């Protein structure tokens, strides 16, 4: 239900941050946040902000 698509994007933003690319990680995070806030699941947006605490 598109929830996996947010988890996929979140993992990518961590990798791009891990590889030392801060700009791409924010962009994938912006895309992951757009979809998450348009999903009916509230845990999805909780995970997004949690990942934002890691970046």
Author numbering: 4 to 58
Study text:
The structure is that of a small (58 residues) engineered protein, LCB2, which was developed in Baker’s laboratory as a blocking ligand of the SARS-CoV-2 spike protein. It was envisioned that solutions of mini-proteins such as LCB2 could be used in the form of a nasal spray to confer temporary protection against the coronavirus infection.
We found that AlphaFold3, AlphaFold2, MultiFOLD, Rosetta, RoseTTAFold and trRosetta all produced successful MR models for this three-helix bundle 58-residue protein, while some of the older predictors failed. While the initial models showed appreciable variability (up to 0.87 Å) and differed substantially from the final coordinates (up to 1.08 Å), the structure determination process fully converged, resulting in six refined models within 0.25 Å from each other. All structures include residues from 4 to 58, with no alternative conformations; they also include from 1 to 4 glycerol molecules and between 18 and 24 water molecules. Indeed, it turns out that residue Asn43 at the center of the loop forms an intermolecular side-chain-to-backbone hydrogen bond with the amide group of residue Glu46 in the symmetry-related protein molecule. This hydrogen bond apparently leads to stretching out of the loop, thus causing the difference between the computer-generated model and the actual structure, see Fig. 1(g). Comparing the six structural solutions, we observe that a number of surface side chains have been solved with different conformations.
